[PDB]
């Protein structure tokens, strides 16, 4: 679909069999979700933003259905201010910026 | 133009006379530029992201040309790790997310 930006570009996603609301973020290299449980092994990681860095859990090759489109990639879980869908998954669903 | 998300969506922008590279960020409500000595009155503000909040200076009605497309609005200046174009301006240039 085509999504304008007058409001935050939030969409529903399916992950680990659960539904969640996430933000399509072209300013994020990776995808980070609020604290939650995900199957498989994870590795401690760190990522930074405007306020500095935070510690996250890195899960690899995780399937995520984003607004109807399928992706399978790295998903970081930690104290993010909001569920963020980054470029690593945005590219997989063929998402682009247009103007 | 159409910007893919394989790499960070950086574009050239013109502001306060200067030319710089900035990230088209759909996950940012506001526009934040790395410290720059802009003239004019400003108001103190606090903006947050991953890692926490930072103090910035808010300037209103500032002209910003994005990749040739003219816009004008609120611009925040502070210790951000990158020049960021938020939705307040992206909507003005008719930028959309498409997949």
């Amino acid at each position: 679909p085509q999504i304008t930006l007058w409001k935050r570009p939030l969409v529903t996603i399916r992950i680990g069999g659960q539904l969640k609301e996430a933000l399509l973020n072209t300013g994020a290299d990776d995808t980070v979700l609020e604290e939650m449980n995900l199957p498989g092994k994870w590795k401690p990681k760190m990522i930074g933003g405007i306020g500095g860095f935070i510690k996250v859990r890195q899960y690899d090759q995780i399937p995520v259905e984003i607004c109807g489109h399928k992706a399978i990639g790295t998903v970081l879980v930690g104290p993010t201010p909001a569920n963020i869908i980054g470029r690593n998954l945005l590219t997989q669903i063929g998402c682009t910026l247009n103007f | 133009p159409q910007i893919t998300l394989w790499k960070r969506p950086l574009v050239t922008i013109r502001i306060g006379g200067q030319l710089k590279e900035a990230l088209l960020n759909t996950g940012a409500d506001d526009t934040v530029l790395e410290e720059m000595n802009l003239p004019g009155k400003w108001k103190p503000k606090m903006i947050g992201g991953i890692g926490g909040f930072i103090k910035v200076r808010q300037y209103d009605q500032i002209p910003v040309e994005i990749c040739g497309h003219k816009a004008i609005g609120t611009v925040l200046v502070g210790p951000t790790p990158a020049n960021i174009i938020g939705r307040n301006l992206l909507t003005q240039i008719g930028c959309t997310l498409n997949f």
Binding site: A28, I47 | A28, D29, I47, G48, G49, I50
Partner: peptide
């Protein structure tokens, strides 16, 4: 308000 910029994993 919220400016969710996110760098590379570290």
């Amino acid at each position: 308000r919220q400016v969710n910029f996110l760098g590379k994993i570290n």
